[PDB]
């Protein structure tokens, strides 16, 4: 009998690996003629059709809490954002001593005391003459020097004005593994993020993942199938957030009704500052709307699943955040270029014991923006003319459990902004990268000639 | 009768020049912190590099035509400049200063070496100014004609070195890429040129610390058996005479002042660290070196210089000839502060066939490192008392005089060129490219 | 009975687009001229071109669909910016000026063309300012309302051209990567399109000077035999006609003004070069060209324009149909001075079937190259008088009007696009991709 080693090259065997996946965007998007911070133009074009191959009899182990595709997406998103603001105007000369007064013309009772009317001396295009100008600033952007104000960022760092020729609207981008690697896609409907995946497939690029930046509420994301899924790294912990994914989307309208005007202030050769002119009409508050019927059931679906982890006879509560800075204690996003900070204390409320209404969520606005929890890298968002309104649907939540001990009768979950990579971890939970290892050796009855 | 047989993989090499890449000990310095010649971005070095000794192969080395030196120079400079790119630029500091002498408990030796200046500067808000003051060393300021200005304002605006990045010389290992090799010379008495009977090949060079100094090689590799005199042409006066010690010489250097640092806000997120005030007595910096230890070391140097200049020659050491401070003094770095010590107490003797020598040392904060023009750097002050205990392992000498008649050779320290500082570490290395194709006759023939 | 057999390395190619790299001789590099067309970036060129003539081959070219022109355009612009990256930005020059006419010796022709302006200015020290003056041409100052300002201040600040660098064109060869080839058409009567019976292949193109000009192609390559007329759609009035003379017409350019350079320090390590005062009399800068050699050349151009428009047509010339200064005039560069000569005296004739003609020329220093906006450059004034002589080796013409089918054709000068200056040099070359695999039938089957 006997056997001799036989060498096979090209065998289907792979091992987990980490590498650099390259982007892939739709070709037609380039014809929009306007660039976006995500640099879809510099990103590779996508293939005309998707190529996916189903793999029978194969079981693989996934882990969404140690996936490295998220850590690369986090760096790419930060890197793209910075590169877009490198060539834009730097608002150092705006760190001067302002003189402000309240606006009261057609001021709504709720909104009184939020918008300031500030005036300051500024240089003109000529380096000798100076001009007296004014601009409206929200109260969250200015502080008093201890009637006399200053921008909040001056004692921390200067900000680069956002170029009005670049957009913030998400543009779907696919992550493609280069040659010698592959991406495995868990096709299971009830996958909970870790463990075996009975169904798997290989694809050349991931689906279109929109880099939506949001807090406490995952918008415009992907919806689950046949149920609501609760996904936590260690469900019986308290410092690990919970990534609920909604089965059925819930719509949330939001608006900034003010009919404000833009105004260009030239502060140097070829560089201009886009200030805010006087408003047109009444001064009101920004807000989003949520149908109370769909939100009342959508928490009805969520509570039932949570009963499968913490108890079948526990009293599930909800509460209004934990407290802290607006960037974590509110639902933040940008709608049209204006950055909202909505107080969602009314969505999470009431306790669970075992048709034409709405829930209005007041929202603040801001212009001096720190995006990625970084210190000294602010940005200034220019104002947008005309009322801006956006309609989107929520598709998840980022909750946190307070961890009560010896009184397990009730578990209270509060929304949590967590880290920004949890926002994208909810879209890459199906994917993992594997490195192909073509060389293999097995025994057979063959031998070499001569 | 015989046919051409081609072999692929033969051990043949030829001298070549390519690009080597860095590699640091990595795990040896865990909890790493940022610094120039970035420890990160260097491929981590293997825990046990494999050195292979080649049996009876003789290679002709040359340390003065070496290209690893030229690439290291352009490489150390590049790492230096790319670290100053993000730090503060002190344009606002090029203003009119009003300085008065420092006399608060000052010693006669340091009577007027540091001034006390007040100047106007803007604050975070551009429309308001602040009046600030700082202590400046007299070497950094020039009178305008009580009104002084920083010495660099009419040449360039200096960048303030970031305080979070250190100047500590972390060791570096230069590695040759695939298809190349690095030949080490194992001979104890190899004078830097000519055949080296003992040869070996390594993946990367040993740990080389880029210690920038002058006329004294600090923290260097020692000669294994004897003091070695190395020069390109010993009979040439215009060639610096490198010297290597077989025994280190401790040099204790310190700054005995208790300086305080003060932060002045000159813009959004920008601070210029002024020298707040000196707490206590004001005394000059200095280095110490044992008189008996050094006088022994110079004895060996003469014992070997005689081999090249004869038995009977009288050999006198003398202090540097002259020039600018950057070249005529033992300039170096100690803890981030830049010293310039007057070495006239070391090189002072005439040689015929417990007590510590103290060298007065000066300080500066406007530094021009690589002899360039217009790229000054401002080293922020360091709070406390500075001290370094490095030990000496070489010299950079020069000679002069003599034309058709001589009986007593005089040597002086010198050398401001920095590639002479790393030429002392890479004298036992060279890079070659492997050539695997070889054709030799054999009796075999192809079948068809 | 036949089977498939594969051949590797067959001579087959197909049209393609790739990145071509520049290669120049080291004459400018060895002496450190530092031309803006960086030869430091470009690789060393081969000692002598190697051209292979491909007999029996027919190839179809198209000079208008050639992509080498669109890749050279981006190369030239990019090399331009990289040279201006370190040069000082003239942001402090945007102040209110106070100008008065110069009349010391100004001749009536140039009366009012330059002004004597004075202004506050910065200094090395941040707390002081200086009062200085400089002569600015009339085209580079707009009355602000005896108070003017630089014309660019409301759009962008200009970087002053590093005086050390040079604008003089130097040949740059475009070389094909591995697996690609360049095919040169050698047919003399080749009209820039269609099959070219005779072809060769070269590794790199001939030296092409990136000469920037308008309405007249200078220092170019001359045709052979007869004058060649080339247009994309010669029956379209929207397409420019790229003439190419077979003999070079010589043009002499100069500015007699003996202006002086003056350096003003506007900050730490930075300087601004003012225009000083002019020694002697101030007069106009002109360009000469023989009226006899220019008359015969149009006689040779007209008999070729006849073949494409008829023998009985009255061929008439006119001057540019108005517009901007940069397009209505023959704008070029020589000696660092940007001329904008008025060519209305060259194109004025009617053809129905020693002496010189002088062209007044203006000068300006705020320059917006490549038809870009907001990226101006300031050209420093040059010492002394400037003179230069050059070929005239082609034109850029345009028709106008459609009143009649064919009665009278008037051809005006053009130059609205900068690529046409380079389409007249690369019209001979096309880049191809080599596909070495090839399968054909043969009587051969694998044994065993």
């Amino acid at each position: 009998e006997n056997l001799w080693v036989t060498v096979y090259y090209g065998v289907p065997v792979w091992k987990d690996a980490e590498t650099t996946l390259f982007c892939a965007s739709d070709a037609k998007a380039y014809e929009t003629e306007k660039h976006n911070v995500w640099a879809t133009h510099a990103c590779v074009p996508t293939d005309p059709n998707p190529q996916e191959i189903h793999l029978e009899n194969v079981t693989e182990e996934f882990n969404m809490w140690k996936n490295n595709m998220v850590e690369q997406m986090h760096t790419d998103i930060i890197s793209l954002w910075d590169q877009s603001l490198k060539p834009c105007v730097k608002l150092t000369p705006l760190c001067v001593t302002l003189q402000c007064t309240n606006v009261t013309n057609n001021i709504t009772d709720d909104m009184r005391g939020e918008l300031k009317n500030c005036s300051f001396n500024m240089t003109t295009e000529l380096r000798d003459k100076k001009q007296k100008v004014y601009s409206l600033f929200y109260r969250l952007d200015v502080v008093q020097i201890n009637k006399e104000y200053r921008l909040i960022n001056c004692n921390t760092s200067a900000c680069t004005q956002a170029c009005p020729k670049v957009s913030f609207e998400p543009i779907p981008i696919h992550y493609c593994a280069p040659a010698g690697f592959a991406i495995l896609k868990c096709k299971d409907k009830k996958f909970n993020g870790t463990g075996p995946c009975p169904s798997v497939s290989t694809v050349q690029c991931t689906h279109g993942i929109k880099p939506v930046v949001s807090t406490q509420l995952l918008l415009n994301g992907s919806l689950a199938e046949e149920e609501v899924m609760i996904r936590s790294e260690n469900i019986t912990n308290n410092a690990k957030n919970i990534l609920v994914q909604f089965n059925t989307p819930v719509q949330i309208n939001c608006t900034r009704p003010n009919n404000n005007t833009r105004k260009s202030i030239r502060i140097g050769p070829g560089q201009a500052f886009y200030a805010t002119g006087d408003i047109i009409g009444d001064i009101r508050q920004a807000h989003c709307n949520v149908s109370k019927a769909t939100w009342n059931e959508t928490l009805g679906k969520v509570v039932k699943q949570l009963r499968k982890h913490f108890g079948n006879n526990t009293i599930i509560r909800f509460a209004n955040s934990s407290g802290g800075d607006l960037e974590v204690t509110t639902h933040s996003f940008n709608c049209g270029g204006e950055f909202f900070y909505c107080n969602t204390s009314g969505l999470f409320n009431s306790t669970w014991i075992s048709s034409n209404d709405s829930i209005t969520l007041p929202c603040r606005i801001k212009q001096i923006i720190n995006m990625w929890q970084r210190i000294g890298q602010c940005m200034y968002a220019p104002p947008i003319q005309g009322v801006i309104r956006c309609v989107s649907n929520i598709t998840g939540l980022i909750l946190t459990r307070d961890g009560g001990s010896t009184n397990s009768t009730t578990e209270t979950f509060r929304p949590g902004g967590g880290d920004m990579r949890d926002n994208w971890r909810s879209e890459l939970y199906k994917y993992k990268v594997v490195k192909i290892e073509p060389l293999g050796v097995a025994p057979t009855r063959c031998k070499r000639r001569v | 009768n015989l046919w051409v047989t081609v072999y692929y993989g033969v051990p043949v090499w030829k001298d070549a020049e390519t690009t080597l890449f860095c590699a640091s000990d990595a795990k040896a310095y865990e909890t790493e912190k940022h610094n120039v010649w970035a420890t990160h971005a260097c491929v981590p070095t293997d825990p046990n590099p494999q050195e292979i000794h080649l049996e009876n192969v003789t290679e002709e080395f040359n340390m003065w035509k070496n290209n690893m030196v030229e690439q290291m120079h352009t490489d150390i400079i590049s790492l230096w400049d790319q670290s100053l790119k993000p730090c503060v630029k002190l344009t606002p500091l090029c203003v009119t200063l009003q300085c008065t002498n420092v006399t608060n408990n000052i010693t006669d030796d340091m009577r007027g070496e540091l001034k006390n200046c007040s100047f106007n500067m803007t604050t975070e808000l551009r429309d308001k100014k602040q009046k600030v003051y700082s202590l400046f060393y007299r070497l950094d300021v020039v009178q305008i004609n009580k009104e002084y200005r920083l010495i660099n304002c009419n040449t360039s605006a200096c960048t303030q070195a970031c305080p979070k990045v250190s100047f500590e010389p972390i060791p570096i290992h230069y590695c040759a890429p695939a298809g190349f090799a690095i030949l080490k010379c194992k001979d104890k008495k190899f004078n830097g040129t000519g055949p080296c009977p003992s040869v070996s090949t390594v993946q990367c060079t040993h740990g080389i610390k880029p210690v920038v100094s002058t006329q004294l090689l600090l923290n260097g590799s020692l000669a294994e058996e004897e003091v070695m005199i190395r020069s390109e042409n010993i009979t040439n006066n215009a060639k610096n005479i490198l010297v290597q010690f077989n025994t280190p010489v401790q040099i204790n250097c310190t700054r005995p002042n208790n300086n305080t640092r003060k932060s002045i806000r000159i813009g959004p997120g920008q601070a210029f660290y002024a020298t707040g005030d000196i707490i206590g007595d004001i005394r000059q910096a200095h280095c110490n070196v044992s008189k008996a230890t050094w006088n022994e070391t110079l004895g060996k140097v003469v014992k070997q210089l005689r081999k090249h200049f004869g038995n009977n020659t009288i050999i006198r050491f003398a202090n540097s000839s002259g020039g600018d401070l950057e070249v005529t003094t033992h300039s170096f770095n100690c803890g981030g502060e830049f010293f310039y010590c007057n070495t006239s107490g070391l090189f002072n003797s005439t040689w015929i066939s417990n007590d510590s020598i103290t060298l007065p040392c000066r300080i500066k904060q406007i530094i021009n490192m690589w002899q360039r023009i217009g790229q000054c750097m401002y080293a922020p002050p360091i709070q406390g008392v500075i001290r370094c205990v490095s030990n000496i392992t070489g010299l950079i000498l020069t000679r002069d005089g003599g034309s058709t008649n001589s009986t007593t050779e005089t040597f002086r320290p010198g050398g401001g060129d920095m590639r002479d500082n790393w030429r002392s570490e890479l004298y036992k290395y060279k890079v070659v490219k492997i050539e695997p194709l070889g054709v030799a006759p054999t009796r075999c023939k192809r079948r068809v | 009975n036949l089977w498939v057999t594969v051949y590797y390395g067959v001579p087959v190619w197909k049209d393609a687009e790739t990145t071509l790299f520049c290669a120049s001789d080291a004459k400018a590099y060895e002496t450190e001229k530092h031309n803006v067309w960086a030869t430091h970036a470009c690789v060393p060129t081969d000692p002598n071109p190697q051209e292979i003539h491909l007999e029996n081959v027919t190839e179809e070219f198209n000079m208008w669909k050639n992509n080498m022109v669109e890749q050279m355009h981006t190369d030239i612009i990019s090399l331009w910016d990289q040279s201006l990256k370190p040069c000082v930005k003239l942001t402090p020059l945007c102040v209110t000026l106070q100008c008065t006419n110069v009349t010391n010796n100004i001749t009536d022709d140039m009366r009012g063309e330059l002004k004597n302006c004075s202004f506050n200015m910065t200094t090395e020290l941040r707390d002081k300012k200086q009062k200085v003056y400089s002569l600015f041409y009339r085209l580079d100052v707009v009355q602000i309302n005896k108070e003017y300002r630089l014309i660019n201040c409301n759009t962008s600040a200009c970087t002053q051209a590093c005086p050390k660098v040079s604008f003089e064109p130097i040949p740059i060869h475009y070389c094909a990567p591995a697996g690609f080839a360049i095919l040169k058409c050698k047919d003399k009567k080749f009209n820039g399109t269609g099959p070219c019976p005779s072809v060769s292949t070269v590794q790199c193109t001939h030296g092409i000077k990136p000469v920037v000009s308008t309405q007249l192609l200078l220092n170019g390559s001359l045709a052979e035999e007869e004058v060649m007329i080339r247009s994309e759609n010669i029956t379209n009035n929207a397409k420019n006609i790229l003439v190419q003379f077979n003999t070079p017409v010589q043009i002499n350019c100069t500015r007699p003004n003996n202006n002086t350079r003056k350096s003003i320090r506007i900050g730490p390590g930075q300087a601004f070069y003012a225009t000083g005062d002019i020694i002697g009399d101030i007069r106009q800068a002109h360009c000469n060209v023989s009226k006899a050699t220019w008359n015969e050349t149009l006689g040779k151009v007209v008999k070729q324009l006849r073949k494409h428009f008829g023998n009985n047509t009255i061929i008439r010339f006119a001057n540019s149909s108005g517009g901007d200064l940069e397009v209505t005039t023959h704008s070029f560069n020589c000696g660092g001075e940007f001329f904008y000569c008025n060519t209305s005296g060259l194109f004025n004739s009617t053809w129905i079937s020693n002496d010189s003609i002088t062209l007044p020329c203006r000068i300006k220093q705020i320059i917006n190259m490549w038809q870009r906006i907001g990226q101006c450059m300031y050209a420093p004034p040059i010492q002394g008088v400037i003179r230069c002589v050059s070929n005239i080796t082609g034109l850029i013409l345009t028709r106008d009007g459609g009143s009649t089918n064919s009665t009278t054709e008037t051809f005006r000068p053009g130059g609205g696009d900068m690529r046409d200056n380079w389409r007249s040099e690369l019209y001979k070359y096309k880049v191809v991709k080599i596909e070495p695999l090839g399968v054909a039938p043969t009587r051969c089957k694998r044994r065993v």
Partner: antibody
Framework: QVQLVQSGAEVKKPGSSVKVSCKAS????????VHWVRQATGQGLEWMGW????????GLAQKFQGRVTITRDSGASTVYMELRGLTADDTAIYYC?????????????????????????????????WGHGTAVTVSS | VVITQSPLFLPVTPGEAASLSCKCS???????????LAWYLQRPGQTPRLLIH???HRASGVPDRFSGSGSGTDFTLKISRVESDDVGTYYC?????????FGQGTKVEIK
């Protein structure tokens, strides 16, 4: 021509205050400055104070610091000087007049980003036009 | 800051000449050296008239017979071709140092 008008004379008891009123032709106070001087029988001229024509500056001598304040109406059509703390020695004749000043740059400090810092110093050139002259007396 | 004048009295006859002096507290080397000095002449029942400003310029309508000079802490004024109307008191006012002040006064009378 620029000309000034003032109010009539008054008499007050010690410790009271007098607020004089002054007017000018053509609203010259919008283009030139205003200064105040008084003089008594056998006594020399005594500079009191002034106000800039832009309104940026209003200076008075230490002799009348706190005891005097100056204000003017809209359009610079009328200007008032108020003296409080009247005493017997204050009996004199007060004059309304206009003077010219030199505005010079005293200290400069450049800025890349923002308006360059500057400090301006006023200097008294001349007194141009005097007013009618108002007599104020303090008596029991 | 203080100012003084001399002589205190000047008995003059028509056709004669007279000279006056003025003092400045500080040798302030600024504003063209001679800096800002103002002279005035007053008579009883009449508002004073400006005579010299900037220490060297003749006021509008003033005959050329009046001139002044000085610098630093001292200043001087001169008169010539005296006539009857020249009687009165002359004041020198310092316009540089804030607060500004008049002078003691120098009287001129017929002789």
């Amino acid at each position: 021509q620029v000309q000034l008008v003032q109010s009539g004379a008054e008499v007050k008891k010690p410790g009271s205050s007098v607020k004089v009123s002054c007017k000018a032709s053509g609203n010259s106070f919008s283009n030139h400055d205003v200064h105040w001087v008084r003089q008594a029988t056998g006594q020399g001229l005594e500079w009191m104070g002034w106000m800039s024509h832009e309104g940026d500056k209003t200076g008075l001598a230490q002799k009348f610091q706190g005891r005097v304040t100056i204000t003017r109406d809209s359009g610079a059509s009328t200007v008032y000087m108020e003296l409080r703390g009247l005493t017997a020695d204050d009996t004199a004749i007060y004059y309304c007049l206009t003077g010219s000043k030199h505005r010079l740059s005293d200290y400069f400090l450049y800025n890349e980003y923002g308006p360059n810092y500057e400090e301006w110093g006023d200097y008294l050139a001349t007194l141009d036009v005097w007013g009618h002259g108002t007599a104020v007396t303090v008596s029991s | 800051v203080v100012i003084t004048q001399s002589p205190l009295f000047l008995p003059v006859t028509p056709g004669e000449a007279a000279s006056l002096s003025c003092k400045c507290s500080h040798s302030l080397q600024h504003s063209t050296g001679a800096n800002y000095l103002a002279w005035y002449l007053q008579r009883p029942g009449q508002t004073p008239r400006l005579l010299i400003h900037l220490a060297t310029h003749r006021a509008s309508g003033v005959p050329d017979r009046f001139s002044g000079s000085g610098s630093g802490t001292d200043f001087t004024l001169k008169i010539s071709r005296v006539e009857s109307d020249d009687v009165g008191t002359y004041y020198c006012m310092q316009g540089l140092h804030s607060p500004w002040t008049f002078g003691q006064g120098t009287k001129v009378e017929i002789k």
